[PDB]
Amino acid sequence: SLPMLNEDITCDTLQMWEAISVKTEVVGISSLINVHYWDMKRVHDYGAGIPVS
């Protein structure tokens, strides 16, 4: 939610919020290497599970 912000009436002008540079990152990215898990299907016999892909 964005606040009210002062308008004008002589020039019929007003203010609006404008985004300029969004920054982003995935915050759950190092949980992807959780190979040990009680249901992950192994690559072969006595192996590790194949990780999430």
Next chain:
Amino acid sequence: PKPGCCPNVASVPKLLVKGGVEVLSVVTGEDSITQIELYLNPRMGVNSPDLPTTSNWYTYTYDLQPKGSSPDQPIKENLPAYSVARVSLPMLNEDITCDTLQMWEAISVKTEVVGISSLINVHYWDMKRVHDYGAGIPVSGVNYHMFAIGGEPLDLQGLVLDYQTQYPKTTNGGPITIETVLGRKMTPKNQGLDPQAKAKLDKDGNYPIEVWCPDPSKNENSRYYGSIQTGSQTPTVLQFSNTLTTVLLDENGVGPLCKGDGLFISCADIVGFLFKTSGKMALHGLPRYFNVTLRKRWVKNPYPVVNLINSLFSNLMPKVSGQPMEGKDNQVEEVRIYEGSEQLPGDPDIVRFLDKFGQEKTVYPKPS
């Protein structure tokens, strides 16, 4: 570019767009002229052609007869109807510091009845013969056409011919009558006009001609032309041309103002009875063509916006279900007002009030 070595022509208003409906969005200058063309298929009891079996007759009623015993009741598709079309308009700029807005206004309406050459089909495969072993009797008798251009929809009042007859009430979008718009069962007082039976029209194929007529009491922003000529097999003469332009200004000098930026066209047309060999006859309409011309005109806003916008919100103006402070049972008892200061009056029990004219007047205490 030499004027003396090249001929000159007259000055004609420049075309800017010619196309469909989606070019009303064009930002024009302060002084433009907009021509818009319409057409209205009449709703003669059969409202739509998409129906599988009942679209055998389009713009025809279904072979109406008198009943023979009171009370009569017609079918939904028995009575004819009007035809309305709110054409869209663009929104136009304003000027808040001088409190003026501009808005559309019609000036000239050109009209013509298309399909007027489809009357002479005297070899129709169900049309009855006027003389035995001969040709067919053409469409004739009752004709009725009434169009209406305007910035607001029409105001039209209940004028039934027999109050005792009952009409099919609206179970789902049905034709509404006096008893639907008022709710109470209709009196014989509405055989003639009755000022507690006004209505506006919003549904095109649902308001019947038979009880409803355009009442010229409240139609300051809608002009309408109409003609009746009624009888059994009377001739019907209608001229049509490409050069009759109806000017539509007022005595004051300005035409209809399209308030709300809608131009409410309104139309109905009946041209004749077609007769059938069995004897059944039916009303048949025709569609009309319109060429209404618009021009942008400045007005003055009568409603102060700052006095108006506060009344709308619940948070900015709270309404509360308190005890009654105006009306018949007002508990607010006495209210004074003080303005300026004069010299000391005779007694503080004296009472003043402003008169009808608007000057102060010390009223005199009479015994009671």
